[PDB]
Design a protein around this motif. Structure first.
Motif, PDB file in Angstrom:
ATOM      1  N   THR A   1       8.628  -6.954  10.347  1.00 16.39           N
ATOM      2  CA  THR A   1       8.629  -7.923  11.124  1.00 16.39           C
ATOM      3  C   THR A   1       7.695  -9.181  10.557  1.00 16.39           C
ATOM      4  O   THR A   1       6.964  -8.854   9.897  1.00 16.39           O
ATOM      5  N   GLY A   2       8.427 -10.496  11.218  1.00 16.26           N
ATOM      6  CA  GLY A   2       7.810 -11.599  10.581  1.00 16.26           C
ATOM      7  C   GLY A   2       6.739 -12.073  11.253  1.00 16.26           C
ATOM      8  O   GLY A   2       5.885 -12.880  10.727  1.00 16.26           O
ATOM      9  N   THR A   3       5.951 -11.510  12.053  1.00 16.67           N
ATOM     10  CA  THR A   3       4.796 -11.954  12.819  1.00 16.67           C
ATOM     11  C   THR A   3       3.527 -11.320  11.981  1.00 16.67           C
ATOM     12  O   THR A   3       2.486 -12.088  11.863  1.00 16.67           O
ATOM     13  N   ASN A   4       3.755 -10.361  11.184  1.00 14.51           N
ATOM     14  CA  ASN A   4       2.658  -9.693  10.353  1.00 14.51           C
ATOM     15  C   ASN A   4       2.601 -10.647   9.124  1.00 14.51           C
ATOM     16  O   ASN A   4       3.101 -11.288   8.597  1.00 14.51           O
ATOM     17  N   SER A   5       1.052 -10.618   8.790  1.00 10.94           N
ATOM     18  CA  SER A   5       0.488 -11.560   7.794  1.00 10.94           C
ATOM     19  C   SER A   5       0.473 -10.452   6.476  1.00 10.94           C
ATOM     20  O   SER A   5       1.256  -9.609   6.582  1.00 10.94           O
ATOM     21  N   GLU A   6       0.200 -11.251   5.315  1.00 10.42           N
ATOM     22  CA  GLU A   6       0.280 -10.329   4.314  1.00 10.42           C
ATOM     23  C   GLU A   6      -0.723  -9.238   4.037  1.00 10.42           C
ATOM     24  O   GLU A   6      -0.577  -8.267   3.559  1.00 10.42           O
ATOM     25  N   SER A   7      -1.796  -9.529   4.650  1.00  9.25           N
ATOM     26  CA  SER A   7      -3.007  -8.419   4.673  1.00  9.25           C
ATOM     27  C   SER A   7      -2.699  -7.232   5.478  1.00  9.25           C
ATOM     28  O   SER A   7      -2.969  -6.051   5.395  1.00  9.25           O
ATOM     29  N   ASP A   8      -2.016  -7.531   6.768  1.00 11.56           N
ATOM     30  CA  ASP A   8      -1.581  -6.569   7.536  1.00 11.56           C
ATOM     31  C   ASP A   8      -0.350  -5.760   6.608  1.00 11.56           C
ATOM     32  O   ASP A   8      -0.527  -4.366   6.741  1.00 11.56           O
ATOM     33  N   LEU A   9       0.553  -6.310   5.907  1.00 16.93           N
ATOM     34  CA  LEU A   9       1.460  -5.507   5.089  1.00 16.93           C
ATOM     35  C   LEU A   9       0.566  -4.834   4.023  1.00 16.93           C
ATOM     36  O   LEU A   9       1.156  -3.779   3.778  1.00 16.93           O
ATOM     37  N   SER A  10      -0.172  -5.415   3.520  1.00 19.82           N
ATOM     38  CA  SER A  10      -1.211  -4.684   2.455  1.00 19.82           C
ATOM     39  C   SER A  10      -1.694  -3.364   2.959  1.00 19.82           C
ATOM     40  O   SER A  10      -1.941  -2.313   2.555  1.00 19.82           O
ATOM     41  N   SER A  11      -2.544  -3.448   4.541  1.00 21.95           N
ATOM     42  CA  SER A  11      -2.929  -2.232   4.867  1.00 21.95           C
ATOM     43  C   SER A  11      -1.741  -1.405   5.352  1.00 21.95           C
ATOM     44  O   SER A  11      -1.841   0.075   5.097  1.00 21.95           O
ATOM     45  N   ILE A  12      -0.525  -1.750   5.955  1.00 23.17           N
ATOM     46  CA  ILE A  12       0.539  -0.647   5.956  1.00 23.17           C
ATOM     47  C   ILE A  12       0.780  -0.246   4.807  1.00 23.17           C
ATOM     48  O   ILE A  12       1.164   1.109   4.759  1.00 23.17           O
ATOM     49  N   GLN A  13       0.960  -0.704   3.692  1.00 19.10           N
ATOM     50  CA  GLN A  13       1.685  -0.190   2.428  1.00 19.10           C
ATOM     51  C   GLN A  13       0.448   0.747   1.819  1.00 19.10           C
ATOM     52  O   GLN A  13       0.752   1.626   1.143  1.00 19.10           O
ATOM     53  N   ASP A  14      -0.872   0.288   2.133  1.00 19.78           N
ATOM     54  CA  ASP A  14      -1.875   1.283   1.638  1.00 19.78           C
ATOM     55  C   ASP A  14      -1.545   2.780   2.432  1.00 19.78           C
ATOM     56  O   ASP A  14      -1.604   3.708   1.807  1.00 19.78           O
ATOM     57  N   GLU A  15      -1.472   2.528   3.810  1.00 25.49           N
ATOM     58  CA  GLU A  15      -1.511   3.837   4.442  1.00 25.49           C
ATOM     59  C   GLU A  15       0.008   4.409   3.914  1.00 25.49           C
ATOM     60  O   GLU A  15       0.150   5.703   3.748  1.00 25.49           O
ATOM     61  N   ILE A  16       0.994   3.697   3.773  1.00 24.46           N
ATOM     62  CA  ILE A  16       2.417   4.384   3.429  1.00 24.46           C
ATOM     63  C   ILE A  16       2.264   5.110   2.099  1.00 24.46           C
ATOM     64  O   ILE A  16       2.617   6.183   1.846  1.00 24.46           O
ATOM     65  N   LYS A  17       1.478   4.505   1.020  1.00 25.41           N
ATOM     66  CA  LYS A  17       1.336   5.037  -0.094  1.00 25.41           C
ATOM     67  C   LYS A  17       0.516   6.288  -0.122  1.00 25.41           C
ATOM     68  O   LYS A  17       0.630   7.370  -1.119  1.00 25.41           O
ATOM     69  N   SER A  18      -0.583   6.306   0.741  1.00 21.44           N
ATOM     70  CA  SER A  18      -1.405   7.202   0.979  1.00 21.44           C
ATOM     71  C   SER A  18      -0.602   8.478   1.119  1.00 21.44           C
ATOM     72  O   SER A  18      -0.741   9.743   0.926  1.00 21.44           O
ATOM     73  N   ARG A  19       0.272   8.396   2.481  1.00 24.78           N
ATOM     74  CA  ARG A  19       1.152   9.303   2.757  1.00 24.78           C
ATOM     75  C   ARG A  19       2.156   9.875   2.086  1.00 24.78           C
ATOM     76  O   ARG A  19       2.458  11.230   1.896  1.00 24.78           O
ATOM     77  N   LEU A  20       2.783   9.102   1.239  1.00 24.25           N
ATOM     78  CA  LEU A  20       3.754   9.624   0.184  1.00 24.25           C
ATOM     79  C   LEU A  20       3.096  10.365  -0.905  1.00 24.25           C
ATOM     80  O   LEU A  20       3.489  11.530  -1.500  1.00 24.25           O
ATOM     81  N   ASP A  21       1.773   9.930  -1.280  1.00 25.82           N
ATOM     82  CA  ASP A  21       1.005  10.908  -2.237  1.00 25.82           C
ATOM     83  C   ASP A  21       0.805  12.070  -1.605  1.00 25.82           C
ATOM     84  O   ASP A  21       0.536  13.111  -2.364  1.00 25.82           O
ATOM     85  N   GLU A  22       0.226  12.049  -0.247  1.00 31.37           N
ATOM     86  CA  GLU A  22       0.056  13.366   0.453  1.00 31.37           C
ATOM     87  C   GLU A  22       1.268  14.345   0.470  1.00 31.37           C
ATOM     88  O   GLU A  22       1.387  15.445   0.384  1.00 31.37           O
ATOM     89  N   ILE A  23       2.621  13.655   0.477  1.00 33.88           N
ATOM     90  CA  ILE A  23       3.810  14.586   0.395  1.00 33.88           C
ATOM     91  C   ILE A  23       3.830  14.944  -1.055  1.00 33.88           C
ATOM     92  O   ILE A  23       4.387  16.267  -1.118  1.00 33.88           O
ATOM     93  N   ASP A  24       3.741  14.297  -1.858  1.00 31.71           N
ATOM     94  CA  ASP A  24       3.581  14.851  -3.310  1.00 31.71           C
ATOM     95  C   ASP A  24       3.040  15.961  -3.626  1.00 31.71           C
ATOM     96  O   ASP A  24       2.937  16.729  -4.139  1.00 31.71           O
ATOM     97  N   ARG A  25       1.542  15.810  -2.938  1.00 33.20           N
ATOM     98  CA  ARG A  25       0.467  16.831  -3.084  1.00 33.20           C
ATOM     99  C   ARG A  25       1.169  18.028  -2.405  1.00 33.20           C
ATOM    100  O   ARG A  25       0.990  19.118  -2.818  1.00 33.20           O
ATOM    101  N   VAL A  26       1.632  17.860  -1.240  1.00 35.82           N
ATOM    102  CA  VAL A  26       2.137  19.079  -0.505  1.00 35.82           C
ATOM    103  C   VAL A  26       3.165  19.893  -1.298  1.00 35.82           C
ATOM    104  O   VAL A  26       3.412  21.174  -1.583  1.00 35.82           O
TER     105      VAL A  26
END
Lengths: 50, 50
Positions: A1-26
């Motif tokens: 979405t265009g409303t989100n700022s850069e730090s918002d995308l940073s937090s979103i990507q941090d959580e996304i990569k955290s969950r992808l790493d969790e998938i790899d761990r599983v």
């Protein structure tokens, strides 16, 4: 979405990569009877006859 | 009569000898039965292992 700022995308990507790493761990850690089922392509043969 | 006595003694001894064959056969049959039990258990183990 265009409303989100850069730090918002940073937090979103941090959580996304955290969950992808969790998938790899599983995938890696989940082992049955000394067999890592979700870690390599293969096949299992069960003797269901005499 | 002497010939008859000879035949009587011979046939009695023959029956006595014959019983020994039955004894040997029964002993060997028991041994074979034990071998059969061992083979059956080995087959079960192979069915479990394959």
């Amino acid at each position: 979405t265009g409303t989100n700022s850069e730090s918002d995308l940073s937090s979103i990507q941090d959580e996304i990569k955290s969950r992808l790493d969790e998938i790899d761990r599983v995938s890696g850690q989940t082992q049955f009877n000394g067999v890592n089922v979700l870690a390599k392509n293969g096949s299992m043969k069960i003797q269901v006859g005499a | 009569a002497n010939r008859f006595t000879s035949n009587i003694k011979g046939l009695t001894q023959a029956a006595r000898n014959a019983n020994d064959g039955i004894s040997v056969a029964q002993t060997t049959e028991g041994a074979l039965s034990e071998i059969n039990n061992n083979l059956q258990r080995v087959r079960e183990l192979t069915v479990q292992a394959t």
